[PDB]
Structures are given as structure tokens and as C-alpha cells.
Amino acid sequence: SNDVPALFTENFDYQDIRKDFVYGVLTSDLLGKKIHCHVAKENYAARVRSLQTYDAISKDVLSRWVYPFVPDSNLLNQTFSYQRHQIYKEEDVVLARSCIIKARTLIGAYTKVGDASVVANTIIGRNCTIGSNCSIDSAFLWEDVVIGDNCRIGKAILANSVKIGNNCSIEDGAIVAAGVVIGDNTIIEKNKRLTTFESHSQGTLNDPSLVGIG
């Protein structure tokens, strides 16, 4: 209600909406005020705050749970379309014959995919390109990302405009930033976040880790 902002100037100590505010009302600190809840029992509602949410939410979005807000609705003039087992393709996207797509996958437009490669449970941005005879599972790819021939990905985040050479590999929980590149015949361990500047994390631009530091 319109009292709240003024009611926040007063009682300036309140900084978190759930921690400080609600407790203040219920403890009668802030007096004579009441609150309520609207326990929803249908449709869908959630917010994005944690990695264990993003991956979760995305796997709920593709699972139709927030219809009409779906890729195949294309609210921003995208060219998506539903296919069985919850795989979502756009238009003008090339797929090799030997390349196969398993369930719960999504492909942006203008994105190529190499041969004999397998993608599953994965989300891929637009205008990407995938190497040949690679393996991707439960990963997340954004726009303008590339992939070298014969590589293993899984349960990791690849930022936009990220380049990965051939013969590379990467395991779960990993995170990269934009512009980061990794040279061929390489590997990256778990949960190792990267960046393009040594603000606080590790990694640099061109060649693998253990290289280009600083």
C-alpha cells in the first residue's frame, strides 16, 4: 500500500523486506498493522536468484509450466516452434544428419551444429556453431558461441561470444565469461568460474588455463 514508502522512511533501520520489515510488524515493533498472503494453487510463479534456480527455472519453462510465456509463442518476433520431447528450434538453423538432438533441448537461430555430435537437456543461444563429434549435456549456451570439433561439455554456463577450440573438455558446475577462449586439447575442472579481467576470479583470454594468467 501507499503507506509503505513513508512507513520505510520512518523505521529507517528496515533494509530487507522479509527479514526486517515483516518481523517488525509481527513483533508489534511497527504497531497496529496487518499483512496477508495469497496462497496460489495453480499456474506458476518463481524468480531468478541462484544458479540452482536458473537451471531449475529454465527446465520448468521449457516444460510448458509458464504457458503462454514459452519459446514457441515468440513474443519478440522470434521464429521458434515446438517439437515433441520439449525440443525447441528456430528458423534458418542447420543440423547435420549424424548430429542428433535429445529431449529438453533448445536451439537459437543462425546456429550451426557439427556432425556426429549429441546435445541433450541443453539451452543454446542464437548464431552459434558446434564442432563435430562432440557431447553436450544439461549445459547453457548463449549467443555467438562456438565449439571445436570433438569436445565434452556438461552442466556448465557458457557466456555470449565465447570461443572453445577442438579436443577440449569441461565438467559440471563450470562458469565462463564473455570473450573467454580456451585452446585445443584441454580440460577445465569443476566449479571453476572464469572472467576476462582479474577483478577477483581467474582466467584470461586466449589459450587454456594455467596460461595467460594476469
Partner 1 sequence: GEFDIVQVYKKFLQDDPEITMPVAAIEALVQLLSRSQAKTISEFMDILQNGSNTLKEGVQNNISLSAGCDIFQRFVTRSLHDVGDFEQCKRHLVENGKLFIQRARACRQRIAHLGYPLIRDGSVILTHGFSRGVAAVLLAAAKRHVRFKVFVTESRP
Q: Is position 84 an interface residue for partner 1 (rule: CB under 8 A)?
A: no
Q: Is position 97 an interface residue for partner 1 (rule: CB under 8 A)?
A: yes
DSSP strand E in the chain: where?
Answer: 81-83, 87-89, 100-101, 112-113, 118-120, 129-130, 135-137, 140-141, 157-158, 163-164, 181-182
C-alpha R_g of the chain = 22
The nearer residue to partner 1, 94 or 211, going by C-beta atoms, is 94
Q: Is position 26 an interface residue for partner 1 (rule: CB under 8 A)?
A: no
Question: To 5 degrees, how large is the angle CA 43–CA 38–CA 49?
Answer: 65
Q: Is position 94 an interface residue for partner 1 (rule: CB under 8 A)?
A: yes
Q: Is position 4 an interface residue for partner 1 (rule: CB under 8 A)?
A: no
Segment contacting partner 1 (CB under 8 A): 7-15, 68-76, 93-101, 128-136?
93-101
N- to C-terminal Cα separation, the chain: 51
The nearer residue to partner 1, 89 or 126, going by C-beta atoms, is 89
Q: Is position 85 an interface residue for partner 1 (rule: CB under 8 A)?
A: no
What are the start-end ranges of the H helices in the chain?
3-9, 23-26, 51-61
Q: At its nearest, how many Å lie between partner 1 and the CB of residue 95?
A: 8
Q: At its nearest, how many Å lie between partner 1 and the CB of residue 94?
A: 7
> Which residues contact partner 1 by CB under 8 A?
94-95, 97
